[PDB]
Amino acid sequence: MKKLQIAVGIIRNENNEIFITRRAADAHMANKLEFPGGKIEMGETPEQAVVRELQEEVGITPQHFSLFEKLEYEFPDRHITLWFWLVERWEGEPWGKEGQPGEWMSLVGLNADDFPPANEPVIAKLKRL
Ligand SMILES: Nc1nc2c([nH]c(=O)n2[C@H]2C[C@H](O)[C@@H](COP(=O)(O)O)O2)c(=O)[nH]1
Ligand SMILES: OC[C@H]1O[C@@](CO)(O[C@H]2O[C@H](CO)[C@@H](O)[C@H](O)[C@H]2O)[C@@H](O)[C@@H]1O
Ligand SMILES: [Mn+2]
Ligand code: NA
């Protein structure tokens, strides 16, 4: 079974809103809401991966960020380790840089059912802030 390390960024603005994108219909976890992110490549660190992934996916450079949560999840056909970084400072303005839907969502209104099930404890913990 495939094993992956994934780095994602929880992009939070001053109004307690999070920048959320929607996954493609033909991707793993198709049509789900997501924190922007992707696979940590060989020769790069988890911190370097979340910077690169957010630059690629939404056109911002995160800075002075923190590890909010790290967890493992076994999907039906793959095992992933997710690194959730809390990003509250960045250069740039996030947008759908890869043509994907993106928008700001109030933290209090997030529905964990809209996200991959691996995100359940993270969305709960975010609402605890
Ligand atoms: N990008 C991203 N991927 C997630 C999240 N939650 C989650 O289980 N995943 C899974 C879906 C994919 O199997 C993998 C990410 O790989 P890609 O972003 O390259 O598709 O991690 C999330 O919040 N953001
Ligand atoms: O691991 C993140 C953690 O480390 C601190 C320093 O104690 O931040 C450092 O690492 C971040 C991720 O690379 C950088 O963004 C930051 O500039 C650097 O100081 C903590 O602030 C953070 O919780
Ligand atoms: Mn991705
Ligand atoms: Na990506």
Side-chain angles (χ1 to χ4, degrees):
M1 166 169 299
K2 338 161 51 164
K3 292 183 170 182
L4 299 165
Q5 305 280 313
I6 303 302
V8 314
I10 300 161
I11 301 157
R12 179 162 79 145
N13 69 15
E14 292 173 345
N15 291 347
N16 211 35
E17 294 160 337
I18 311 293
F19 190 85
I20 299 300
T21 54
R22 191 178 292 270
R23 295 180 61 81
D26 52 2
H28 182 249
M29 285 296 106
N31 300 312
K32 294 284 187 188
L33 293 186
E34 59 161 7
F35 308 118
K39 179 195 169 184
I40 301 166
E41 303 167 356
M42 181 91 64
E44 100 190 320
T45 66
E47 301 94 332
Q48 287 170 337
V50 72
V51 165
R52 178 186 51 74
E53 288 287 345
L54 265 50
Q55 288 170 339
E56 295 177 5
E57 291 209 342
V58 306
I60 70 182
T61 292
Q63 50 213 192
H64 193 50
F65 51 95
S66 55
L67 185 61
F68 188 74
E69 178 81 294
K70 174 185 169 192
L71 56 81
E72 310 210 21
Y73 193 83
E74 173 105 344
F75 288 103
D77 73 336
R78 66 196 74 196
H79 185 90
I80 73 170
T81 300
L82 279 151
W83 301 66
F84 295 87
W85 302 92
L86 180 58
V87 176
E88 294 166 310
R89 172 173 289 281
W90 62 86
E91 297 175 23
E93 184 71 43
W95 66 292
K97 174 171 176 182
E98 292 178 350
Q100 79 277 41
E103 58 184 13
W104 290 100
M105 308 190 168
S106 75
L107 180 47
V108 298
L110 289 183
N111 184 339
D113 296 329
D114 294 338
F115 292 79
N119 293 29
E120 288 265 350
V122 172
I123 284 155
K125 178 181 174 175
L126 275 172
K127 293 183 173 189
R128 199 78 46 255
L129 300 186

